[PDB]
Amino acid sequence: SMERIEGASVGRCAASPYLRPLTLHYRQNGAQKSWDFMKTHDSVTVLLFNSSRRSLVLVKQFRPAVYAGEVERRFPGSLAAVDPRELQPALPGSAGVTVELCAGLVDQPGLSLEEVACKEAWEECGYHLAPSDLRRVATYWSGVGLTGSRQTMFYTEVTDAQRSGPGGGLLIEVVHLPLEGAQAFADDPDIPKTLGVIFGVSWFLSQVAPNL
Amino acid sequence: MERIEGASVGRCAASPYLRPLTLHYRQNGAQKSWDFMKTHDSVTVLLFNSSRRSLVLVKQFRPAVYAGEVERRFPGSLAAVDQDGPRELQPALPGSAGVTVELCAGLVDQPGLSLEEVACKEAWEECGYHLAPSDLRRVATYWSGVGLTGSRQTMFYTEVTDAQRSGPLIEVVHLPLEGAQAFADDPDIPKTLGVIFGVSWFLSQVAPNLD
Ligand SMILES: CN1CCC(n2nc(-c3ccc(Oc4ccccc4)cc3)c3c(N)ncnc32)CC1
Ligand SMILES: CN1CCC(n2nc(-c3ccc(Oc4ccccc4)cc3)c3c(N)ncnc32)CC1
Ligand SMILES: [Mg+2]
């Protein structure tokens, strides 16, 4: 359903609420330089372990920027000199479907990072969390080359008693990855995923799974 | 490397590194659009100098990290720039606010080169270590951006000795194995997820088989 993508076309983007390209001009040890980047929000990510199912909770969705990069890789020149053309040839929508950690932007003032992660775990994963349930795994710079944003990773264990039914949050597929093949899943090069997934899986297996 | 002066922020229109695009597509039969930046793929490489029992990392000023740190502390610093040229950030932050610790890394922007060759070029240019492409082992491939970019990053690993190190801006960091995990766990040390993962991966997957 969410992997069904047709009529894909690419065009130049002028104004956008989501793209804030900027250039920093600066003198570094006397020499004048410039650097191109984008203003973006900080973010949080949360890894959930469902102990009732012995499974890590991830999310699957279509990422248009991933899709377009995959189309370019397979058909070079697809995204060339665009500055509204139909992608011919194109790829199935599954080429842009990623596996990710539950994640969201820090763009609501008055909310702690924990509260942001709880809202995203509800809205994306259908899991009811309390902010005090969350343990900070790591904080780091994401996208140091083009974005200056901090990202904070949380972890929490959940049970099926915290899982919402089908429907509920008024398109994302919730993924439950069994611990059996979790490492093999992260190591699988044919599955488009993020470093947060790869790190989250190996961190959980080496830091949490032994103590269960 | 850390002496950063006259910092000012202006609009970015062209840029070889960020190209604004919109994907138009029908998903649930419904017409949608998505704005993103076309960017380069990248490679990173984690080096383990077995002569020194140290991981090799790089320290450098990252202007985007700096600007984000100046937006924090001086909110509105990165507001929309008008037509009177760049807006001076006076006062700003010391350059150290933008200094990161990272894996050796670089852009995939030279046609004809394999990913391994890009990694070797960077390990020489940034770390002063001579590598052959056959020395590199693929650790992980992943999407480093998914939301506003769709860039792929490939992480390599190799063991080196001092025999591959050249003799006597970027700082080469040699992180002893003894304190590596505590270094990676330290939130006061501005580092990337690549460093956190690379340290954790090395200590769990490579280190136990040494000695
Ligand atoms: C000599 N040398 C050449 C490249 C010049 N250069 N590099 C970048 C840039 C862009 C993206 C990028 O992404 C990565 C790559 C690897 C790992 C993580 C992120 C890194 C650097 C750039 C920029 N954004 N704006 C202006 N000039 C920029 C600087 C001067
Ligand atoms: C209903 N809903 C509203 C937002 C709409 N929307 N979201 C994005 C967008 C931008 C950045 C972004 O960053 C993240 C966030 C979390 C984790 C990783 C990366 C995520 C989404 C967007 C876009 N770039 N262009 C056009 N429309 C876009 C879609 C439809
Ligand atoms: Mg460099």
Author numbering:
A (entry chain A): 0 to 82, 86 to 172, 178 to 219
B (entry chain B): 1 to 168, 178 to 220
Show sentences the authors wrote.
NUDIX hydrolases are conserved throughout eukaryotes, bacteria, archaea, and viruses. A recent systematic exploration of the NUDIX family confirmed that both NUDT5 and NUDT14 are able to hydrolyze ADPr and ADP-glucose, yet the function and cellular roles of NUDT14 remain elusive. Here, by screening a small kinase inhibitor library, we identify ibrutinib as a dual inhibitor of NUDT5 and NUDT14 catalytic activities.
Notably, this structure also revealed the hitherto unresolved conformation of the N-terminal domain in NUDT14, which consists of β-sheets intertwined with the NUDIX domain of the second subunit. Similar to NUDT5, compound 9 occupies the active site of NUDT14 where the heterocyclic core is involved in π–π stacking interactions with W34 of chain A and Y17 of chain B. In addition, the aminopyrimidine moiety is stabilized by hydrogen bonds with D35 and the aromatic ring of the phenoxy substituent interacts with L107 via hydrophobic interaction. Compared to DMSO control, 9 led to a strong increase in NUDT14 thermal stability (ΔTm = 5.5 ± 0.3).
